[PDB]
Nucleic acid binder design. Structure first.
Ligand SMILES: Nc1ncnc2c1ncn2[C@H]1CC[C@@H](COP(=O)(O)OP(=O)(O)OP(=O)(O)O)O1
Ligand SMILES: OC[C@H]1O[C@@](CO)(O[C@H]2O[C@H](CO)[C@@H](O)[C@H](O)[C@H]2O)[C@@H](O)[C@@H]1O
Ligand SMILES: [Mg+2]
Ligand SMILES: [Mg+2]
Lengths: 556, 411
DNA sequence: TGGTCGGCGCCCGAACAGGGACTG
DNA sequence: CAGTCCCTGTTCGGGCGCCG
C-alpha cells in the first residue's frame, strides 16, 4: 500500500490493439530544467508522482511554461502520441457561461481550486502509460522516470474527467443548499447567495470544508471576498459587469498574423461594445499565403479600424438578468451585410451586444439576412437565458408579410414589433403575379459553346423588336441571364419577359438585392427601375411561340 | 431478474456520437424532474465521460396533453441497430389497418421500462442534460431498461406484448392491432361509441399487466390530390404557355399526355395577354388529357425493400402539398393539407404539423416512416422544430430549395 | 528557445455533394 | 441513355480571440 486512495476514479482503456507511448524527450534548456526538477521532486512526497523501474517501457516528452501573471511554473506533458491511442471521451463542457446570464446576488464569492488536475486520481491500470524521463543540467546524469498517480496536464481525458469528478463532489452540497448558486467552470467556482454577507461567508467556508474532504484545496490567494470579482475574463460588480480591458496592437506596419489578433480581439469586444465592425479588416485576410506576410491597410479597413478604436475609447458595461422582466433584442442594419444587435430588459441598459455579418449565398437580400440574425440571436439567447427575446426589427410589418407569404420556403420570425429606426429593410422590387396588359412581351434566350466559350444572347418581341449580341468567354447560364438583362435594358417601365432558363428564373424570383455576380447586380439595378415586371417560364424545344424563334437566333 | 436479449450494432458501425442541442428553461426543468424520478426508479443511472457515445434529448407535449414527455432522438442509434429490428424481431404490417373506419393510437412506451436492457448495449443509450448558461457541465445518464423511442424496445418486448394482447384479440377477432415504436395502433370498423369502449377494454388489459390515450384517426376518410387542369371560358397566350409547361412536366408521370394540338395555338410571337380561341382539336386534346389525369399511373406498387421518400411544397395561403414515393415519378400517394395549426401566421409550425401527419399516414399504410425533403432552410428548421413537435418518433429529413417554375401539384 | 489539453466564438478556403443542361 | 461542365451550397479543418 505505497500510495493512498482519495476519490472515485474513472476507468480509462486504451484504443483496442494499441500500446503506450514511446518517444524521446526534448533537448530542454537548463534554465527551464531548474524550475521543472524542483517541482517534480515535490510531487513524489504528496503521492502525485511515482518512480518506475525500467520495467516501464514508455517515454513521452515534457516541457513547461510560466503561469501568466505569476512567478509559478506550469507542468505540461506533450501527450500528443498518447492522445492518439487513448479511448475517446464525451466532453461534458457544452459551452461558456456568460455574465449576462447571472442574476443579481447580494453576496458573491469566487474561489479557485489549487492543483486541480493534480488532486484527481488517474485510473490505476492506466497509470503506467504516463511514463516520462526527467532531464539534467548535463547529459551525464540520467534523470528519474516517473508515472502520474493523478490527472496530468496535456492529456486529452483530463478536462472531462476533472469536470465530471468536480460535479459529483459538488452535487451533495448543492442538494443541502438549494438556494446557493454555484457556477462550476473547470476549477473556478462562482458562489452567489442572497444571504447577508456574514452568513454567506459561513457557507463559503463550509463549502471549503466540503471540498477539503475530497482533497480539493482552495487557497486564500485566489479567494475573492471583495468586488469587483475577476471571473471568466469579466469584471463583476454588484449591479454591472464589463470585459477586462483589451489592448489593441498599435503597429504601423501590419502583417497577416497581426490582423488575426486584431480581428479576434474585436470579436471578443463586440459582446458588450455596440457597433464593432470587422468586415473590412477581414477583407485583408482572404486568399493570403504566409501568416508572416506583411499587408497594407486599405482606406476601408483603416477608416473602419479608426471608429472601432473610438468605440472602445468610452467604457461600457452590461447589467444582469431579471427573470421577472421581458427579454428584448433589437437589430440594426449596418450596411454591407453587417448587422448588430442589443439584448436588454430596461431600455438603454444592455445585457449584451453582438454582430451578425455572415454572407450566406451567392445571391441574397436584406430580409433573408435579417432572418438569419434573428435565428442566431434566438439560439444564443436560449443558451444564456433559456428563452427567446421579443424582437424589435427595422422592417415594416407589411414588408415581412409580403415576403414570407409569397416565398417558396417555410420561413418565420418569433414574436416581434416594428421599430422605425432607419435604414429600414425592404424589398426593392416585386414581380407581378399575372401578365401585364399592354406591355411589350420579350422572348429571351441565350446559348454558348462549351468548347469555344462563345455565345449569343438575344430577344424577340410581339411588336417586332429584335436583338442578338455576341459574347465571348461565357456559359449557357451566363447568356441566359444576359438575355434577360437585354430585355430589361431595352424595354419600357412595364415589361413581360418569357424565358426557358430555370437557373435565371430561380435567382430572380427570390428577389435578391445583392449578388456576388456583377451581371445579377445589373439585372437587379434594372428591376428596381421598372414599374411592373412579369417573368414567365416555358420549356425549351417544345415549339412554343417566341421561345422557338429566339432560340434559333442565339443557337446560330 | 428477467433475461436480457443481447443486442449488437450493424457490423462495422460504431455507436452514436451526436451533440446535445440547447434546450429552453421549461424543457430543462421538465427533463431534470423526469430524470430524477427515473433514476430513483432505477430506469436510468448516471455515467462518466469515459462513455464516448451521446444522443440528443429534449421534451415534448403531445396534442392537448399539457404534461411533459421525455423524448430521445435515437435516429442515429436506430440506423446503427437497423438490421436487428427489421431482420430478427420485426413486426408484420397489417394491410387491413388503413381500411378500418377508426384507428386509435396508444402510447405503450411505459411498458418498455419493465424489461431490462443488455448490459453491453446500455453504453449506447447515453444522453447528456444541459444547463442554462452552462452553470454546470452536462449531467450524463444511460438507460438500464428498454428506452422509449429506440427501435429495439418494441421488438424485444414483442414476445411480452402478444401474450398481453392475446386475450383481447380472441375476444374481438375483427379488430386490428399494429405496433410502431412506442405506439399501438388499434383499428376497428365499429361505430364510434363501441370503438372508444373497446379501447378502454384494451386499456384495463394493459393496466393489469402493470397510459390513457386519445388520438383518433380515420384512414378511410383519407383522400388523394389529383393533378388538375384549369377550366377557362377564354385562354390567353400566357394561360396556354402555363398549361403546356404543366402538361409537359406531367408527361413524365402519365406518358399518354400530348401537347401537339395545344402547342399549335402558340405558333407566332404573340403578346402574353392576347386571347386565343381553342380549336376543336385542342379542346379534345385537353379533354383526353383531363381524363388521363383521373387515371392511375401504370405499374406503381409499394416495394418493401425500398425507402419511402416524402416531398412537400408550400403553396401559400396555408396550403401544403405532398407526394410519397420510392422511385421518381412513381408516386404511391399524393395529398394536400389546408387550414392546419399555425395557418396564416407560422410556416414552421405548419410544416411541422404536415411532417407529423404524413409520417402517421405512412405508419398506417406501410409501417414505415419516410425520409422528408423539407422546403425550408436548415437553420430555420433546427431553430424551431422542437417547439412544435408533438410525436414520439422522429423521421429522417433533408433540406431542399426548389423554386417553383410551374404549379403542377396545386392549381 | 520553437513545443500540451478541452470548450466556445469569428472568418477563411478547400474539398465534397448534387441538380440541370448539354454533348456523344 | 453516361458523362461532362456550371453553379450552388455544405462541411470541415485551419488560424486567431476568449475561458480553465
Ligand atoms: N495552458 C494550459 N494547458 C493545459 N491545461 C491547462 C492550461 N491552463 C489551464 N489548464 C488546466 C489545468 C488545470 C486547470 C488550471 O487552472 P489553474 O490555472 O488555476 O491552475 P491550477 O492547477 O488550478 O493551480 P492553481 O492556479 O489553483 O494554483 O485548467
Ligand atoms: O437536422 C440535421 C441534424 O441532424 C443531426 C442532429 O440531431 O442528426 C439527426 O438528424 C439527421 C437527419 O435526419 C439524421 O441523419 C441523424 O441520424 C440524426 O441523428 C445532425 O448531426 C444533423 O446536422
Ligand atoms: Mg486552480
Ligand atoms: Mg435556348
Amino acid at each position: 500500500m505505497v500510495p493512498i486512495s482519495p476519490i472515485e476514479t474513472v476507468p480509462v482503456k486504451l484504443k483496442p490493439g494499441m500500446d503506450g507511448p514511446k518517444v524521446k524527450q526534448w533537448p530542454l534548456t537548463e534554465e527551464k530544467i531548474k524550475a521543472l526538477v524542483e517541482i517534480c521532486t515535490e510531487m513524489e512526497k504528496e503521492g502525485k508522482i511515482s518512480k518506475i523501474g525500467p520495467e516501464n517501457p514508455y517515454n513521452t516528452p515534457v516541457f513547461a511554461i510560466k503561469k501568466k501573471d505569476s512567478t509559478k511554473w506550469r507542468k505540461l506533458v506533450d501527450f500528443r502520441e498518447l492522445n492518439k491511442r487513448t479511448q475517446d471521451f464525451w466532453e461534458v463542457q457544452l459551452g461558456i457561461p456568460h455574465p449576462a446570464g447571472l442574476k443579481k446576488k447580494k453576496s458573491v464569492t469566487v474561489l479557485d481550486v489549487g492543483d486541480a488536475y493534480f488532486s484527481v486520481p488517474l485510473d490505476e491500470d492506466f497509470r503506467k502509460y504516463t511514463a516520462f524521463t526527467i532531464p539534467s543540467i548535463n547529459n551525464e546524469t540520467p534523470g528519474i522516470r516517473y508515472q502520474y498517480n493523478v490527472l496530468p496536464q496535456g492529456w486529452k481525458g483530463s478536462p472531462a474527467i476533472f469536470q465530471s469528478s468536480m460535479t459529483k463532489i459538488l452535487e451533495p452540497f448543492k442538494k443541502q443548499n438549494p438556494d446557493i448558486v454555484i457556477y462550476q467552470y473547470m476549477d473556478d467556482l462562482y458562489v452567489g447567495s442572497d444571504l447577508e454577507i456574514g452568513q454567506h461567508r459561513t457557507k463559503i467556508e463550509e463549502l471549503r470544508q466540503h471540498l477539503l474532504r475530497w482533497g480539493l484545496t482552495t487557497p486564500d490567494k485566489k479567494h475573492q471576498k471583495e468586488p469587483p470579482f475577476l471571473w471568466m475574463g469579466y469584471e463583476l460588480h454588484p449591479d454591472k459587469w464589463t470585459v477586462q480591458p483589451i489592448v489593441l496592437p498599435e503597429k504601423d506596419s501590419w502583417t497577416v498574423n497581426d490582423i488575426c489578433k486584431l480581428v479576434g480581439k474585436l470579436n471578443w469586444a463586440s459582446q458588450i461594445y455596440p457597433g464593432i465592425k470587422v468586415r473590412q479588416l477581414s477583407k485583408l485576410l482572404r486568399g493570403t499565403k504566409a501568416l508572416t506576410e506583411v499587408i497594407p491597410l486599405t482606406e476601408e479597413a483603416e477608416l473602419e479600424l479608426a471608429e472601432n478604436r473610438e468605440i472602445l475609447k468610452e467604457p461600457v458595461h452590461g447589467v444582469y438578468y431579471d427573470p421577472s422582466k421581458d427579454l428584448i433584442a433589437e437589430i440594426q442594419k449596418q450596411g454591407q451585410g453587417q448587422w448588430t444587435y442589443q439584448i436588454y430588459q430596461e431600455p438603454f441598459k444592455n445585457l449584451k451586444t453582438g454582430k451578425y455579418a455572415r454572407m450566406r449565398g451567392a445571391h441574397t437580400n436584406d430580409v433573408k439576412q435579417l432572418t438569419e440574425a434573428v435565428q442566431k440571436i434566438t439560439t444564443e439567447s436560449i443558451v444564456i437565458w433559456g428563452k427567446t427575446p421579443k424582437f424589435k426589427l427595422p422592417i415594416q410589418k407589411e414588408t415581412w408579410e409580403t415576403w414570407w407569404t409569397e416565398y417558396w420556403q417555410a420561413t418565420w420570425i418569433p414574436e416581434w414589433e416594428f421599430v422605425n429606426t432607419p435604414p429600414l429593410v425592404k424589398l426593392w422590387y416585386q414581380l407581378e403575379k399575372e401578365p401585364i396588359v399592354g406591355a411589350e412581351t420579350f422572348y429571351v434566350d441565350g446559348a454558348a459553346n462549351r468548347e469555344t466559350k462563345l455565345g449569343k444572347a438575344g430577344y424577340v418581341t410581339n411588336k417586332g423588336r429584335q436583338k442578338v449580341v455576341p459574347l465571348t468567354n461565357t456559359t449557357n447560364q451566363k447568356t441566359e441571364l444576359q438575355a434577360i438583362y437585354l430585355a430589361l435594358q431595352d424595354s419600357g417601365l412595364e415589361v413581360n419577359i418569357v424565358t426557358n432558363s430555370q437557373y435565371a428564373l430561380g435567382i430572380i424570383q427570390a428577389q435578391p438585392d445583392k449578388s456576388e455576380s456583377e451581371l445579377v447586380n445589373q439585372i437587379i439595378e434594372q428591376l428596381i427601375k421598372k414599374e411592373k415586371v412579369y417573368l414567365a417560364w416555358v420549356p425549351a424545344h417544345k415549339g412554343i411561340g417566341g421561345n422557338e424563334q429566339v432560340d434559333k437566333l442565339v443557337s446560330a | 431478474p428477467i433475461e436480457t436479449v443481447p443486442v449488437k450494432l450493424k457490423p462495422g458501425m460504431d455507436g452514436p456520437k451526436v451533440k446535445q442541442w440547447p434546450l429552453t428553461e421549461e424543457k430543462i426543468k421538465a427533463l431534470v424532474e423526469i430524470c430524477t424520478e427515473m433514476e430513483k426508479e432505477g430506469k436510468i443511472s448516471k455515467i462518466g465521460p469515459e462513455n464516448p457515445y451521446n444522443t440528443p434529448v429534449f421534451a415534448i407535449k403531445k396534442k392537448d396533453s399539457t404534461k411533459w414527455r421525455k423524448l430521445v432522438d435515437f435516429r442515429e442509434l436506430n440506423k446503427r441497430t437497423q438490421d436487428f429490428w427489421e431482420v430478427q424481431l420485426g413486426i408484420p404490417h397489417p394491410a387491413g389497418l388503413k381500411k378500418k373506419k377508426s384507428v386509435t393510437v396508444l402510447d405503450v412506451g411505459d411498458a418498455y421500462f419493465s424489461v431490462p436492457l443488455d448490459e453491453d448495449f446500455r453504453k449506447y443509450t447515453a444522453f447528456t442534460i444541459p444547463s442554462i448558461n452552462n452553470e454546470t457541465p452536462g449531467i450524463r445518464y444511460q438507460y438500464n431498461v428498454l428506452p422509449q423511442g429506440w427501435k429495439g424496445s418494441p421488438a424485444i418486448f414483442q414476445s411480452s406484448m402478444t401474450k398481453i394482447l392475446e386475450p383481447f384479440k380472441k375476444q374481438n377477432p375483427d379488430i386490428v392491432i399494429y405496433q410502431y415504436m412506442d405506439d399501438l395502433y388499434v383499428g376497428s370498423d365499429l361505430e364510434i361509441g363501441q370503438h372508444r369502449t373497446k379501447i378502454e377494454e384494451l386499456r384495463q388489459h394493459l393496466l393489469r399487466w402493470g397510459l390513457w390515450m386519445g388520438y383518433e384517426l380515420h384512414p378511410d376518410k383519407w383522400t388523394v390530390q389529383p393533378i388538375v387542369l384549369p377550366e377557362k371560358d377564354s385562354w390567353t397566350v400566357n394561360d396556354i404557355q402555363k398549361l403546356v409547361g404543366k402538361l409537359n412536366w406531367a408527361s413524365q408521370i402519365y406518358p399518354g399526355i400530348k401537347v401537339r394540338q395545344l402547342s399549335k395555338l402558340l405558333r407566332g410571337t404573340k403578346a402574353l395577354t392576347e386571347v386565343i380561341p381553342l380549336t376543336e382539336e385542342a379542346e379534345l386534346e385537353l379533354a383526353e388529357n383531363r381524363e388521363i389525369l383521373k387515371e392511375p399511373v401504370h405499374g406503381v406498387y409499394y416495394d418493401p425493400s425500398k425507402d419511402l421518400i416524402a416531398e412537400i411544397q408550400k403553396q401559400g395561403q396555408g396550403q401544403w402539398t405532398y407526394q410519397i414515393y420510392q422511385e421518381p415519378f412513381k408516386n404511391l400517394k399524393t395529398g394536400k393539407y389546408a387550414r392546419m395549426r399555425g395557418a396564416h401566421t407560422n410556416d414552421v409550425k405548419q410544416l411541422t404539423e404536415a411532417v407529423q401527419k404524413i409520417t402517421t399516414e405512412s405508419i398506417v399504410i406501410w409501417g414505415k416512416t419516410p425520409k422528408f425533403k423539407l422546403p425550408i432552410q436548415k437553420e430555420t428548421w433546427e431553430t424551431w422544430w422542437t417547439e412544435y413537435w408533438q410525436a414520439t418518433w422522429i423521421p429522417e429529413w433533408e433540406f431542399v430549395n426548389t423554386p417553383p417554375l410551374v404549379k403542377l401539384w396545386y392549381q
